[PDB]
Amino acid sequence: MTQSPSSLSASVGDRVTITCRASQSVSSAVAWYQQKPGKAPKLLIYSASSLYSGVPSRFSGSRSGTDFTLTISSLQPEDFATYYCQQSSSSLITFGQGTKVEIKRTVAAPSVFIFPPSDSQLKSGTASVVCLLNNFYPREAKVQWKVDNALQSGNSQESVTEQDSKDSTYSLSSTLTLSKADYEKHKVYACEVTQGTTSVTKSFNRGE
């Protein structure tokens, strides 16, 4: 079942509308669920337009022609989630592809921290250097590693948290992985984060 906004970005207070099309030709009233990252999804609307008990009134569903819609009348920061529509055919239940809902907000710059590799990790032959980008928006940002000002390639990996529930910012970590051999052949370790019109570099010297 194709839900139409596959992904979506909108500001607090906005009104948001996701569409869901019946797959069969024998129409089936739609249920809608909210799912937060890796948590059990929660029911919101059932029987096309009935608000499930406990769900705030800003949620609502109805029909649009032969399809169904879900509406959040006043988008709120806790509402970032993936939203699924659900149907029954004939002893088969099918969900739709999902619709990811991101809060839009004002730009925020990260606090950048760089962490040297620990002494006990180095004892075992490998060096993990980690760069931390705290509480920023939007999530796109080129983080880049430098070793004695040499740009790195293919030895980094990132992962971002999902949006903070009250301020909508992301956090990012980038781990540079080197062998204890190569880490101790070099002196200056830096990670640079470029967001639009500024780059901020944090660095340390192996002899701290």
Binding site: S47, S49, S50, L51, S53, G54
Partner: protein, 127 residues
Amino acid sequence: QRQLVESGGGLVQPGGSLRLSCAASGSTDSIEYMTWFRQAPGKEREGVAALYTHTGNTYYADSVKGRFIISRDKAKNMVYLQMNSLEPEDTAVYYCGATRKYVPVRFALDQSSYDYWGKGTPVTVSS
């Protein structure tokens, strides 16, 4: 095979009305209560309207008083639930249950008092 069958549910705008019917089989004068229950997502199945078969006395949940009417037809062993002034909070699957063992009337609207049940007929009340 003693069994019960609801029918008559559909979709309804707020303020509208609808009439459900339940039909029993087997032999029907041994029953002593016919009642309508309803069950909504995430909520307990709740007694709405009981009918004492042998005096015709009726018992209503405070949430449906005056809007709903349970009535019978021994000529047919059909019980009915006239639902008036429907509102969204009435949205639920509506079930018909029967007992043939006597229970005191204060328990007439209790789920536990009923030996057998229909599969239910759905009611959606929505703008």
